[PDB]
Amino acid sequence: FXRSCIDTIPKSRCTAFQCKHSLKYRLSFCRKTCGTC
């Protein structure tokens, strides 16, 4: 089992802290903000 690059949570949640402490953000929720896409 598997769209484009888009999050499921209010981008307003992806903070410079989540993109550094939370990896799932740089490869799950923050698939654009962290410029990971």
Task: Give the whole-angstrom CA distance, residue 19 versus residue 2.
Answer: 24
The one-letter code for the residue type at 32 is K
Cα–Cα nearest to 30, from 3, 2, 20, 1: 20
Cα–Cα nearest to 27, from 1, 7, 13: 7
Cα–Cα nearest to 31, from 5, 11, 2: 5
Q: Which experimental technique did the depositors report for determining this structure?
A: NMR
Task: Give the whole-angstrom CA distance, residue 11 versus residue 23.
Answer: 15
